[PDB]
Design a binder for these strands. Sequence first.
RNA 1: CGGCGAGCGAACGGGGAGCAGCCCAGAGCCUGAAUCAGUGUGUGUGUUAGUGGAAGCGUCUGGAAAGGCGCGCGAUACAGGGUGACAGCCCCGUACACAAAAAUGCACAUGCUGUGAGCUCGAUGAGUAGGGCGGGACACGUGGUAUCCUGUCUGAAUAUGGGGGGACCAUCCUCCAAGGCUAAAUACUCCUGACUGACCGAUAGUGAACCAGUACCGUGAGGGAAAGGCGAAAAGAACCCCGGCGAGGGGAGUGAAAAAGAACCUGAAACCGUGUACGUACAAGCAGUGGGAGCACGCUUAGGCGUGUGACUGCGUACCUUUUGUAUAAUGGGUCAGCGACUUAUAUUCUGUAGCAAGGUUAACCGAAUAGGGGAGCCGAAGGGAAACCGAGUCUUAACUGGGCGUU
RNA 2: ACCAUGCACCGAAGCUGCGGCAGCGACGCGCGUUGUUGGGUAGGGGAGCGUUCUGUAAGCCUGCGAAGGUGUGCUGU
RNA 3: GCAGGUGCGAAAGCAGGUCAUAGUGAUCCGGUGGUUCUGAAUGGAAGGGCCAUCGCUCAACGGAUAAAAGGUACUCCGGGGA
Lengths: 64, 144, 117, 201
Amino acid sequence: PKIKTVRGAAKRFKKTGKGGFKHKHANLRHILTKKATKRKRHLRPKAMVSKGDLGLVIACLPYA
Amino acid sequence: MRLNTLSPAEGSKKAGKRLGRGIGSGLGKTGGRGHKGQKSRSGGGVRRGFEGGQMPLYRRLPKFGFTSRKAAITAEIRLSDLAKVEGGVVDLNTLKAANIIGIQIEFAKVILAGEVTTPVTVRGLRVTKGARAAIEAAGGKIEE
Amino acid sequence: ARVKRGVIARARHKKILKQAKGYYGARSRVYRVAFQAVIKAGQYAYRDRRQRKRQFRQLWIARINAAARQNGISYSKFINGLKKASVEIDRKILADIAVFDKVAFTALVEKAKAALA
Amino acid sequence: MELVLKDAQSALTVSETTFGRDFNEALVHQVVVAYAAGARQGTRAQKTRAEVTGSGKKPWRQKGTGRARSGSIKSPIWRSGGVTFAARPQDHSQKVNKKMYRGALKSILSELVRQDRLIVVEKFSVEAPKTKLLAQKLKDMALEDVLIITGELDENLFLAARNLHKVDVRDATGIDPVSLIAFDKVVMTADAVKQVEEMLA
RNA sequence: CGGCGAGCGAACGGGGAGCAGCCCAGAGCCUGAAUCAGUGUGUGUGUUAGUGGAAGCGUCUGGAAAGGCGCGCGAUACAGGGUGACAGCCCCGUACACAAAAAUGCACAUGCUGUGAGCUCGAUGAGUAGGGCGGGACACGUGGUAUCCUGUCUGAAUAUGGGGGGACCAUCCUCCAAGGCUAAAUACUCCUGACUGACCGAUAGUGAACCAGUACCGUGAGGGAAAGGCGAAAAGAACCCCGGCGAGGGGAGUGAAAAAGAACCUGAAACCGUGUACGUACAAGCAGUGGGAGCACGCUUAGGCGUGUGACUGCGUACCUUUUGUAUAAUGGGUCAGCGACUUAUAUUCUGUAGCAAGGUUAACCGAAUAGGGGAGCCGAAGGGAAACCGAGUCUUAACUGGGCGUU
RNA sequence: ACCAUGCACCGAAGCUGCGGCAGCGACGCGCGUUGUUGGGUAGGGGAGCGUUCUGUAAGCCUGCGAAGGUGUGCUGU
RNA sequence: GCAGGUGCGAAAGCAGGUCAUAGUGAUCCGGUGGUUCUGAAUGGAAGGGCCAUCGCUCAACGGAUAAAAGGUACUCCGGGGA
Ligand SMILES: [Mg+2]
Ligand SMILES: [Mg+2]
Ligand SMILES: [Mg+2]
Ligand SMILES: [Mg+2]
Ligand SMILES: [Mg+2]
Ligand SMILES: [Mg+2]
Ligand SMILES: [Mg+2]
Ligand SMILES: [Mg+2]
Ligand SMILES: [Mg+2]
Ligand SMILES: [Mg+2]
Ligand SMILES: [Mg+2]
Ligand SMILES: [Mg+2]
Ligand SMILES: [Mg+2]
Ligand SMILES: [Mg+2]
Ligand SMILES: [Mg+2]
Ligand SMILES: [Mg+2]
Ligand SMILES: [Mg+2]
Ligand SMILES: [Mg+2]
Ligand SMILES: [Mg+2]
Ligand SMILES: [Mg+2]
Ligand SMILES: [Mg+2]
Ligand SMILES: [Mg+2]
Ligand SMILES: [Mg+2]
Ligand SMILES: [Mg+2]
Ligand SMILES: [Mg+2]
Ligand SMILES: [Mg+2]
Ligand SMILES: [Mg+2]
Ligand SMILES: [Mg+2]
Ligand SMILES: [Mg+2]
Ligand SMILES: [Mg+2]
Ligand SMILES: [Mg+2]
Ligand SMILES: [Mg+2]
Ligand SMILES: [Mg+2]
Ligand SMILES: [Mg+2]
Ligand SMILES: [Mg+2]
Ligand SMILES: [Mg+2]
Ligand SMILES: [Mg+2]
Ligand SMILES: [Mg+2]
Ligand SMILES: [Mg+2]
Ligand SMILES: [Mg+2]
Ligand SMILES: [Mg+2]
Ligand SMILES: [Mg+2]
Ligand SMILES: [Mg+2]
Ligand SMILES: [Mg+2]
Ligand SMILES: [Mg+2]
Ligand SMILES: [Mg+2]
Ligand SMILES: [Mg+2]
């Protein structure tokens, strides 16, 4: 039968132009008063999935 | 040429692996599975994304975004598709008739992709700056 | 496409058993034992093609030593003297001569002695 | 391209792309193998351990008897047990790209011309549905194993050919790559030649 | 949707198969008028027995010819089966052409018969819709949750009225619940016929090729085997002999063959004997291997050689598995034969190969079509952004000297 | 026996010699030249043998003896 | 270092917390404010997104549940001379 997408993965990764995946940074959900403005600022933009984790992400998202 | 003189192209018919048929094959006695453990077992192996129990990548990262329903009914049209509309005028219905956009598309945008060589009238579509310049250089017209 | 194994399996077992002729008891009769016997015979033969060269050189040397001592010189001095005389006859031929042509071997000893002193 | 008739000794001019192309052996081989795979019925089965008749009782207790542990009388290890990977009915047919099929046919027809195995005639018919008449006709033209392709299927010719095992009579639209290769000679009417032309564009 | 985990998973819309619409909640008027059921009768097809159905000889081998060789003949019949080896022409069939006293399927047709058409006026399903509580169903786990069903308590409008459009309101659109019937496309196969298989071929294939759901086991539910082949034909061995008026055997006879004799085709291996050659009763161990005398038999040069044996002598602790590591006194195997473990379907990615190429390719289905049709779709030629949106750019920010992802 | 000095020799599947096979690379037309390499578990890569079945095959072999069984000789890594 | 706005200094300048190195908790689910980005016929709305922020001795501190102690000499299986 058709492979089933890991739905939670589809809610956290989007495929980019050259086949990589973008994701939102962790650590910007809650307790934030104690975190420096610089640290939170650098967590705001999306980042690319690293080479080690690309295999896991690709396995989870066959239909990306 | 006969039914007994026809051969496949070289390199097109690689033989399949056959595990467990003796020492000489290179795949005897463990079938390439190595020694024991979960992965050596029939049916063995862990699910996709599993990392051994550590909070896996697809869960330690946050969800983001929402899905636009409008995006699903919006298409893009290349300049190379302008000629393929038979009738000289490019609009939603003529684009659909030529199989350029989907039947349920309601909004469409012409972009600078490919090249246009004929005077065409674009009607009811959005057009990017570059695509508009290209169409108008080709003698075309853009009507809203 | 069911395949019956009988003809091929019998051919294989018969090949091994033919290689096991002369062996004792089950080793010449029973495929499980015979196969191991044939494998081990092969291992021994591979080893002993090297060993055979060792053993024959050892035998030639012992015979040369005997014949040389019959002519008044030890093996080691005899070989050194032959080397100093530029005599390149090897020990297989030297052993053969020591057994079959004792006058010629005496001549070789005299040559070795003249080279030595 | 020029195809010279046998009985009327005129020439029918034909597409070079159809009847004069290079022989593509790998493509023809793929299409011929696909045709053979398409002829398979694939009707068979064996019984897994689930489908062998018998009960699920454990043949003997897990420990203490001194025997190897048994769980099912239907184990494939056992005599009368299931077949480990028991077969099921199968569909062996393969896809052939339309263009791949047509390219194979063109390669075959061109190779037939190159081998002098395609014979074009203006007409090929029989007076009556009589096997003897067609056998005589074929003896006259020195054909024994021959695929006869006509513009439209005939009744008398089809009946006359039926009892000749080295002979097959086809409509132009009923050609197949394997038949074109399998018979020593292919005899095609000029009407059939045009029809095959328009079939392969 | 989802301890937003594992998983579950639509709809709208599009292409196809098939297509069919009607009654009651009632009175006129008309009437019986389509349909519709039984029931006739015919009329056609089936079905259930059947009939005819072409064309070959000689010679060779052989136990036997259908095989070889030679020369013929039929074929709308060279499907298939049989016959002493392989038969178009020997036989049964096969193509083709025919056939029913009787029963019966269906399909027409018009007779009896009940159900009653078209028509105007009118009517338009209430403890129901909806609600409160508890559950359940919807892809949808109560969630912001529409909609459906209802165990419990309630409870309307009713056409100027009412339901729905995914909380909810307004506006618009669309439909008419609380009565009912309805063919086809769809599902299946205990059972019957015909035909087919890159399905099995006696440990396989059904458990069962054979008097098998039997023998046998169990109180019972229930469980559940093993076991096929003489020969072309029984011509299945008259008769004689040893033997207990035995068993068994030796002859004789049949047969191509009885070393096909019924304990029967072929007749492997483990295992057990008889015969011959060589070795072996002062000799220590994975039993072989390297060296090697002697003996016996045999070879076209008369020479050594070939075959078998193997005194004596160097070296030498099986195999598998598991382990850091096993001669290990760790595992497993008494031996042989037969069987016994990486498959299959679908989706997805990569490699090779083939086709076509900024295009590629169709699915269901249609079609007698492995053709042809069918482009519904899917993937690709554009990305950025959460998104609106912009677009070879875009996002970030008030804005980039910029930076991220893209563009060549 | 031990210390010291020295020259001989024995000694491995190390090295050399002779014959042969194969991998890889450089250089010339699958051939050659030349350099080099070839212990191996898990494991990855490459290339093959044989078995049953389908086409080729209404062909070919076969009662002047098929398959199977049992010997013998030749032959390839 | 760049843009905006700022403090101290006459000025050159210094300042994006503290001499530095511990003082901490992913994701989910939700809460609060801001922001028409989205808004299932349409206008709104709900809900969602985005930005800021809040709720864990999840301390077994990469946190398996929102939610969990014992007995077996009545014992049982798969394994290890790890
Ligand atoms: Mg937040
Ligand atoms: Mg290996
Ligand atoms: Mg193991
Ligand atoms: Mg381990
Ligand atoms: Mg492992
Ligand atoms: Mg399992
Ligand atoms: Mg389309
Ligand atoms: Mg078979
Ligand atoms: Mg024996
Ligand atoms: Mg079975
Ligand atoms: Mg097609
Ligand atoms: Mg007849
Ligand atoms: Mg016979
Ligand atoms: Mg109503
Ligand atoms: Mg209700
Ligand atoms: Mg409600
Ligand atoms: Mg309702
Ligand atoms: Mg509503
Ligand atoms: Mg709405
Ligand atoms: Mg309307
Ligand atoms: Mg059976
Ligand atoms: Mg048998
Ligand atoms: Mg008797
Ligand atoms: Mg027979
Ligand atoms: Mg027998
Ligand atoms: Mg003795
Ligand atoms: Mg003694
Ligand atoms: Mg020893
Ligand atoms: Mg240990
Ligand atoms: Mg050891
Ligand atoms: Mg012991
Ligand atoms: Mg042991
Ligand atoms: Mg044991
Ligand atoms: Mg895009
Ligand atoms: Mg050496
Ligand atoms: Mg070496
Ligand atoms: Mg080496
Ligand atoms: Mg190696
Ligand atoms: Mg075959
Ligand atoms: Mg301080
Ligand atoms: Mg400090
Ligand atoms: Mg709305
Ligand atoms: Mg931890
Ligand atoms: Mg944990
Ligand atoms: Mg235990
Ligand atoms: Mg153990
Ligand atoms: Mg220990």
